[PDB]
Structure formats: C-alpha cells, structure tokens
Ligand binder design. Structure first.
Ligand SMILES: C#CCCCCn1cnc2c(N)ncnc21
Ligand SMILES: C#CCCCCn1cnc2c(N)ncnc21
Ligand SMILES: C#CCCCCn1cnc2c(N)ncnc21
Ligand SMILES: C#CCCCCn1cnc2c(N)ncnc21
Lengths: 261, 261, 261, 261
C-alpha cells in the first residue's frame, strides 16, 4: 500500500532508508507521507515515538514498524541486516497486526487539551512544591506531596515507569499504571507508596491544592501548563497497531533488553 | 438458601455468629456447612482465608461475605453493627455477586499437586540458597538468586505483594503479579528487579538449578516440598464470588486501609 | 550574650518573637542581628534553614535554637509553650552545644563557587537528559543516567534523602550520603542503585558527558548553572552548633516525626 | 612469622595452597594453624568467612589475606596468578594492616550468648509471624512486623544488606546498619521503612512481643534460638585486620563487583 519512512537522521539511518525506498520501488508500493498505511521508523525508540506522534490522528489506518540502528528498542525490534527481508515481506502484505493500549491525558483550564501517550505522561510542579489531590473515579484517594507522578501505558512500563519502581505489565493488559516520584511520607503526610494499576474506564484525576502551574510531559514532549484546574488520566479508546512478521514475545524483548542479549 | 458461618473463635465473633443464626431463624434459611450457598466469615482476613480454603471445591456455588470484628479487612468488609441489616438483606436475596481472579499453583515431582490461592503463593528454599530458573511461556527469562519469589492475585496485591514493592492492581484485571524477595544482583548475577504482571493464559515456571527442596506457601498454608521438578503459576479458571449489598469500591477499601479511616 | 530572632512571619510566630524579646529585656542580653551569638528560629525547618544560611559565615560563633510553631521539625525542636523557660535558661547560659556535620559543594566553570548545605545538595539537568560521570577520589565509578543525584548530610538524611530511599544516619557520624533519582538501568547502562555513604575527606566529583548546564540546589536554594566543568562534594570542615537545654535524642526525634507523636 | 592456609577444597584451591606452602618453605615461615599470625584464604568470600570465624578469638594477632579462585570477592581480593608475588612480599613482611569494624550480637535467655559478625546478623521468626519491639538506647522506637531484620557491618553492606535496599558504607566508618525485610505498613502498623545507620556505642535491642523463638543468623551460620528475651546489637570493640600489599580501594572494589570488571 502507501508507506513512508522516518529516519533518525544520522548517516546510517538515512542510507538504510534510501536503500529500502529503492527496494520498495520494485513492488506495488507508493511513498506517501500524508496518508500512509505503513510507517517505518529507522533509529531508536525516540525516533519511533516521533513517528507515532506525527500520525497520531490516523492511528486506525496505520501499522507501525521499527528498525533499530543503535541498541535494541522495545518498539524498534528489527535489525538493519533484515531490512531487505522486511521490504519483501511487507510488499506482499498479509502480515498480521498487534495492538497496544494507549493513555489519554486531559488537561482542563479556566479551555481543555487532550494528549495521547505511547509510553507515559508525567506531572511535576513549575519550580515550587508539588501538591495534588489524587481522585479515583470521583473518590478522594490521597494528597500527594513529592516530586511528581507518572502514568504509564503497559508498553511504557519498561521506560520511566521502571526507573520509578513500577511493575512491568504485558501489553495485552488494557491498563495504566501510576507511580510516585519521591513522595514525602511522615506522620502527617501519607501516600500509598506502591504503584497503582488501573483498568480500562477508571478515571484518575489530579486536582491542585495551592499552585495551579504544572510541567506536564507526554512521552518526549514537555510543556509548562498554567491555570490548570484538573489533569485527567484514562486508558484511551485508541490503540497503536504494529505490523508483525515473526515471533518476538514481549517477555523475550524484556529479557534481551535488561537481562542479556 | 443454605448458609454457614465461620467464626474467629474469640468471644465477640462467636456471640455475633449465634445472634446471626438466631436472626436467620426468622427466614427461609437453612444452616448447612456441607453444601452452603452463602458462607459468612466473622473475624479478620485470616478467618476469611480459612473459609475460602474450606470450600474451595464448591467455589462456583458459593457467594462469600466477610464481617470484620477487629480491624478492617480487604475481604471482611462489613462492620459487626450492620449484622442485623446483613441478615435481612441476605435472607431476601436478590443481591448481586462480584468475582475476583485466583492463582493456580502446580507442583510437579518425580506425582503432581495443584493449589488455589486467594492472596498469593511464595517459594523459598529449605535452608540453603534459593536458585531457580524462571521460565515464561517456555522462554528462559532469568536465573533468580535471592530469598524467594511471590506470585500474587489482584486482591492479594495489598498483602505480602505490597510489602515486597509490588503494584496494587484492581481486582477486575485478570492477572497475576510476580515479585522478588531480596534478589542478588551483581555483574555476574542479574534479575529483572521489577515486579512482573502476567495476563491470563501466561504460564510462569520455576525450575530448580541445584537443590530440589522448597518451602512453598499458599496463602496461610506453608508446606516443605521435596524432589520438586517444576513449580507452575497461572491465572486460575476458577473465581471467588462475593455477595455485595452496597458500594464499597476497591480503591476506597485501599484508602481506608493504608491512608486513613 | 548577643542574640537575634527570625520569624516565619505569620501572626503566631511574630507575636511569639516579640514576647521573647520582651522577656529577654529582663536579662543581660542585647538584640544584635549583625554579630549575634545565639540565633533563635521561630517557624518550621524552612525558617531554620534560612536562619542557617543567613549567618553561614559566622558558624563558629553561633549556637542555633529552633522553635516550631507548626508541626515538629528536626531542627525546630522546642514547643512555643516552653518559650518562657527557653528565655530563662538561655539568659543564664551555661548550656552545652551540639555540632552536626555539613556538606561542601564546589562548582567549577571555565571561576568557581562554593556552597554549604545543612540538608542536601542536588543536581539535575536543565531540561534535557541528565548524564554525568561519577568520580570518587579520582577513580571513575559510574556513568549515571537518570533524573539526578542528591548528596545529603547526616541530619539531612531525614529530608529529601529519605524520600529517595536513602538511609537515616545519626548526625554524630561525619559523613555524606549520595542517592539516585530515577536511574536508568538496562544491559548497556549500569548504576550502583544503592545509596552510598562517604566518610570525611572522600571527594565525589560529577563530570559532564554532553550537556554542561545543570540545575543545582543547596537546601531550599536552586540555581541554574551554565558551562559547568565539575561538581565537587565533600564533608565540610565547618559545623553547625546547637544550644541544647535538655535531652531530645535524634532517634526519638525520628520516632516522633515518622512513627507517632 | 607463623601462617596457615585454608582452601575452598576444590582441585584448583588445594593445588594453589600446596604451591604457596612450597614457596613459603623457601623463607623464615612456619606453618601453624593453631596460633598463626597470617591467615590466607583461598576460594571465595564464603571460604574467607569460615577462616574469620575459625580464628575469631585471636583477631588481635592475625592479619587476613584472601585469594579468589572463582569470581572477585570483597574479602578475597588477590588473583591466583599473583600468588608467587604474594608469597614473596608476605615472607619479607613490613606490609601495612587495615582494620574493618565488626558487629557484636548478644542473645539473652531466661543464660546469654555473644557472636561476632563480619558481614551481618539477621533475625527471623521460627515459622509464625515475626513481631519485635525495636529499642534504641533504651528508647522504644518501633514495633516491627514483617519477615525479619538485618544488622550489617560496613563491609557487610555490599552483601545481604545491599539486597534489602541498604546503603553501601565505606568500611572506615565505625557503624552498623539495620535494614527491614518485607515490613508490613498500614494505618495501624508503622515502621520507619528506611535503613538506619548507627554509630559506635549505640545499642539496638530487639524484644519479643508474643513468640520468643527466633532463627538468628550470623554470617553463614543460622541457629534456631528458643526462649529469647532480648537480641542486642552494637559495634564490636574488636576488629578484623587485613594485610594489604597494594592499593585496592573499597570504592574500586565496589565498582569491579557491581558495575564492570
Ligand atoms: C534515556 C531515555 C529514555 C528511554 C529511552 C529508551 N526507551 C524509550 N521508550 C522505551 C520503552 N517503552 N521501554 C524501554 N525503553 C524505552
Ligand atoms: C500479618 C499479616 C498478613 C496479612 C494480614 C492482612 N491481610 C490478609 N490478606 C490481606 C489482603 N489481601 N490485603 C491486605 N491485607 C491482608
Ligand atoms: C516539604 C518539604 C521539604 C521538607 C520539609 C521538612 N524538612 C526540612 N528539613 C528536614 C529535615 N532535615 N528532616 C526532616 N524533615 C525536614
Ligand atoms: C550468594 C550469596 C551470599 C553472598 C556471597 C558474596 N558475598 C559474601 N560476602 C560478601 C560481601 N561482604 N560483599 C559482597 N558480596 C559478598
């Protein structure tokens, strides 16, 4: 079908991109970076994340594929040496697709902005102390005092979530996971401490106590938000689709990245 | 229908049990502790766990209810003062039921024994060092060296799992969670560190490296197993059923138990 | 001798300050906020920290005393009701002094700035990724990738250090403690993970890998530093002195603040 | 002077031991395993620990040396290839000695037993729940509910202590460090959570609440103690002495063992 290729931009990835375009030129494939049906990312997980966010409005019509030119990534799980085999199998098609859940973040003011995350969304203060009330399905759960909070997708659990002590979740589980950044706990201030894993349709709301300015990140993007009244997290109804051509199980991918490869 | 009541055995719980039996005597209810359809547990979560394991062969035909005479429990979520209202609403019936997932443990030798857990199943060595190979869906994931491992149900995540750094999972998620006990990590021995959350139909297998004797716990029960060839964990096909009479959300229950009440 | 009083500035603390000044007026005491020999802090630990940094150039000639008008502080360990008894015992004098160690931070550029910390000094990046090489007594120890690092005094171990998983150290131990903020660990990036406790005369040096701009905090003060070549930590030769009038052991202070009071 | 050599007992270590004995036969050295002045340990840290405990009554008159035939140890820090150079430099003498602190454990009954630890001493229950009151210098600090507690020397901080989240302490610091094993924390049960570092002359006492039987380990030795009234921890007055022949800094040893070598 239609396809496009994004590159990390170093010499290795650009040349690999040109060679795949040349190989694709031998098949019934059209290069189209406006309405592609296949998006190939050549680089690392950062390059893949930019590809995802470049097309996050046509997620239902795109299958993503990542090629890692540096270290193995959790999204870029093809070696450059297999690019020719990848061109061939992609050109025929008849691959099967795999879907991972995504996280929806809603930021309300006094309008409203929504964001989609593949890895996670984090909230920190704009300099001063970070205090928010944590509201779960309209029930006041805790008053969090600390550095910040992180809400992760299942596939994001191997990223910032993991560094904060969160669990690794298999991406077939439609959930999101909330982890704390350096929470203050004494006899007057109390947080749950543990990571919290929320199912689909649960809404986690962050509500300011004093300051209403927050630094909110969504994957690699970080924006300073002002006059915030609420930050809303829930499992998205939208999903990212991967073209898969062989067996590379998530738990094997975790093994290769953190234990040995 | 038919019902039975188990008591913690202290004076408060026995008297409360006799009063509920007397109140039940005013309705179309029969006391039957062989084939009950309702099992009432009066005490704490330990009393409730014994009730669960007393009838773990009729789980499809029983709705459990817990009354806490001491501190609030995650399973015993009725106060003793509401016992009269509980008798009345139970006698009419037409309550609705809630189901939590359970964990299946299979221990193979050179026969085979299976166990059902409501909270968790743990494995430790019989004195010497604990070393096992961790196999996930037939893929060798890690060689674990440490004190032991804990596999928790969702409702068990607030128990031993929480003390080991595991995430708290909403019990509507059909999953199990594996946490490490004091893992050894240096440049030659490597574990994942993080808790791992597994979906339904994933099989986690523990396989001995040297010693084949292990102390295996299932909820409160702990047995020394000898000549073990494999320990197998998976989400059970069976589920525990709760009679629910009002709204007491899991996250509110977590708040009441760990933040304040 | 000479004395001064700093106030949190709310109504309660200012009035308490005026009453102590009036009570001090009945003794051989002179109010002098240029060269005081006693510095009284009325408020919380933040107020006490500002008092410390106000006079950090006359530390050898000052004994500090803290009165807590809100919650109990680790430095402000007098209740407001005892202020009259505090005035009386201070006026006579013949109290005994207790000294806590301090942390010296040196920031070098391409001049050089030094800072003294009572609680801790932290380093984070100026937006992008934080990567530094950690050098211990000229030996290259690790390449740290994460959110940042925190170096704490013994009395600071109950503050940010504690939130990052650090140990609590009795302040009679002349040491500093380095803790990690969300370190990245995989098969290519490796940090020690554990907190590190360094004795007097050990020098811990942070050296940039790519970016040379860092946000460095010293207690409550946080400054963006540019063109940094090295950040140097060591136990200071200078110490803070407390006037003590009764027994309030550090471990009792820890109990009162985190377990119950 | 007088010397003896202990071996791990595998072929490699025994042969290395015989070759060093033969090399020592060319100098003014006498093999004496009753009153040696030098104790050489050939194996790993377990072999070294047995050598330490074999002679823990002549600690003032012995300098220890460890040769690692397997992986690098924190106590066995000589390679087998340097054994000939080790024999030569040892025979002349005029090496300098380094001392590490040790932990004293006192177990009282209704007589009293004392133990010396090079790594750590741990306390667990004999099957049932572990509950002890933690008393610091006669001040009741906390009621600990969990799996157990671990008190570590500075050089022991890289061992079990590290696996429990404890800090790594440079062994020039005369201290001990207490870490928790899976503590239970909810709104009714409260522990400090953090590791605690105690200076010389502080006494940490564990006192039973219900059960009085405990499994107490001291380094590799683990004994079931019955009718215990108190367990007492303090930095020992005795110290282990190492013969050192070159520079191998503790922090470099930590780097080699956990980061890379
Ligand atoms: C440095 C830095 C930030 C992380 C870079 C690597 N990375 C990106 N995304 C992921 C992910 N989902 N799982 C594991 N690793 C990931
Ligand atoms: C002491 C001890 C063992 C734990 C007793 C309390 N307890 C039992 N089960 C649970 C559970 N599922 N969640 C939270 N708390 C629980
Ligand atoms: C919020 C916030 C920041 C911390 C405020 C309380 N605080 C200040 N200093 C300390 C300290 N040394 N030990 C314990 N608590 C402390
Ligand atoms: C398996 C197992 C138990 C630990 C074996 C290795 N080991 C022994 N002692 C130490 C120590 N002091 N520091 C680091 N590693 C040590």
């Amino acid at each position: 079908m239609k396809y496009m290729i994004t590159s990390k931009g170093d010499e290795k990835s650009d040349l690999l991109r040109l060679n795949m375009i040349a190989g694709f030129g031998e098949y019934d494939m059209e290069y189209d970076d406006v309405e592609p049906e296949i998006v190939i990312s050549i680089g690392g997980d950062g390059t893949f994340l930019s590809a995802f966010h470049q097309y996050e409005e046509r997620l239902d019509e795109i299958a993503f594929i990542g090629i890692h030119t540096g270290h193995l990534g959790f999204y870029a799980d093809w070696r450059p040496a297999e690019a020719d085999k990848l061109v061939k199998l992609l050109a025929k098609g008849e691959y099967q697709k795999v879907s991972y859940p995504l996280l929806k973040t809603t930021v309300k003011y006094g309008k409203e902005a929504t964001y989609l995350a593949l890895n996670e969304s984090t909230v920190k203060s704009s300099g001063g102390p970070f205090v928010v009330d944590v509201v779960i399905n309209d029930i006041h759960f805790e008053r969090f005092r600390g550095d910040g909070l992180c809400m992760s997708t299942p596939s994001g659990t191997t990223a910032y979530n993991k560094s904060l002590g969160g669990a690794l979740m298999h991406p077939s589980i439609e959930a999101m996971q909330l982890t704390e950044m350096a929470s203050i706990n004494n006899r007057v201030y109390r947080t749950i401490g543990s990571p919290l894993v929320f199912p689909k349709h649960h809404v986690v709301s962050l509500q300011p106590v004093n300051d209403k300015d927050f630094q909110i990140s969504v994957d690699h993007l970080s924006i300073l938000h002002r006059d915030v009244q609420e930050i809303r997290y829930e499992v998205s109804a939208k999903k990212i689709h991967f073209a898969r051509f062989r067996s590379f199980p998530f738990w094997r991918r975790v093994h290769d990245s953190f234990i040995e490869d």
